[PDB]
Every structure is written in C-alpha cells, then in structure tokens.
Copies of this chain bind each other. A is one copy, B any other.
Amino acid sequence: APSRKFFVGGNWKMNGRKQSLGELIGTLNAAKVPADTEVVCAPPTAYIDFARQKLDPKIAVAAQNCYKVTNGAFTGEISPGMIKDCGATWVVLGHSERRHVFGESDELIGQKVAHALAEGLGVIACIGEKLDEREAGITEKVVFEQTKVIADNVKDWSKVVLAYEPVWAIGTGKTATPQQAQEVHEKLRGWLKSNVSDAVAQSTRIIYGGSVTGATCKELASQPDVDGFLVGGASLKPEFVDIINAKQ
C-alpha cells in the first residue's frame, strides 16, 4: 500500500529576479495545492530568503545546493545552517548540473548529504546516468553507485526523496518515455528494498527529474514507482500548478 505522498519540486535553477519570481510566487500563493501533494520550490541561491518570505507557509523552500560544513573559508558557498536560517527546509543535492557542469563528485555529494541531513534539513538527492552511460546499458550500474553513496550517508530516509534524472535525454537527441521512466524508478525502489529495507523502499518517494510539463505530468504521474516530479523549466510558469495536480 504505497501511501507515499506525491512530491512536486520546482527547480527554478538560475532564472528569475524579484519581479518575475515574486510574480511566480503570487500564482502558487493564489493556487490551491492538493492536501495530498507536497510542493517544494528551489529558488536561485540569492532568492532563497526572498522566496521563503513571499512564499505561502504551505509551500516549502529548497536550496539548489550547499556545502558540507556549517561555516568556513568557502567563498561563494553556503551551509545547511544558513539555508535553515532562511526558513528553507530542503536542499537539492547531486543535481546533474552540479555533477557535470561543475564536476561535483559523489564523495563530496555524499558528504553534503550527510551534513545537510545532520543539520536537520530535508534533502532532494538527485541521481542519473549520462548519455554514454545510457548507450552502454550501464543505467543500473551508474544509478546504483550514486544511490549507494546517498544511502550510506542517509541514516534516516524520512528527510529524503530521490529524484531520477535521465541526463541521457537532456539535450542529447534522445527522448525519455514514461515507461522507461518507471523502468528506472523500479530498479531504484528495488535497490532500496534490497539494500536498505522493505519499508524504506515502500515509503521513499522517487520523483522524476526529466522533462515534465502540465501536458505530460498525468502520464508520468500514473506510473507506479513515480510518485513525484522535480520540475525544471515548467516550474517557472503557471503550468507548475497543473503539475501540482498531475496525480489527480
């Protein structure tokens, strides 16, 4: 009985300013999210406070990243305590952009996860295999190694959700279908049940982090092992509300 509460995150990435963002917050603030869905918004780092202040207490705020120490000589970086200090209760970790564009390693990612969590912050842990990894059929290998690192650094799965990112269908000329989406979420839940525990795997939300719009959210949402989304571009528009109601 997968009573997993639908999870819908909105990764604005590096987009928006007070104006467009405040305007965005206005739409969701005036929107009516299903009492059965959990909605989170990940604003640009400079607008985490702005967003949380303007954001309706019903919606949680999430950082798009953080470091592995409470304080230190790390110009440009922020710690989970600040993220908490700003009212944000979540942190996106391991986003494909952070791993690839910025080269963040699993080791460092594993350390931010353990720290973020120790700091009492929720954690949206992102995984996903690149195009070549997909072309080889190493999807399982790749995604299990990343999840494992996340699991070894997670002593409590209540504060975490998994987001699978089909980086292989991101600007590559390959398209990811909802079936192959489920296929992956399946193995990931299978990895948990087997490597963690039956309960954890049954409660842990595994959200889809691939191309999601109000037009395709219904299909993807109907998938058994897909209990949520981590929306990118669409999280900047009114359509985000439609995605908030995909499971419905």
Contact = CB atoms under 8 A, between A and B. Distances in A.
Interface string A164-185: 0000000100000001000100
Interface stretch (A31-39, A47-55, A213-221): A47-55
B50 A141 contact: no
A17 B73 contact: no
A63 B44 CA distance: 13
A75 interface: yes
Interface in A6-59: 11, 13-19, 42, 44-50
A114 B133 CA distance: 10
Nearest to A44: B78
Contacts of A74: 13-14, 97, 101
Contact of A14 (B11, B44, B71, B114): B71
B73 A46 contact: no
A246 B210 CA distance: 41
Copies of this chain, whole number: 4
Contact of A145 (B63, B78, B79, B137): B137
Given A46-B46, A46-B83, 10 more contacts: A13-B72, A17-B81, A46-B63, A75-B97, A102-B102, A105-B141, A105-B197, A106-B197, A107-B198, A132-B183
Interface of A: 11, 13-19, 42, 44-50, 63-65, 67, 69, 71-79, 81-83, 85-86, 92, 95-98, 101-103, 105-108, 114, 118, 132-133, 136-138, 141-142, 145, 152-153, 155, 171, 179, 183, 186, 194-199, 232-233
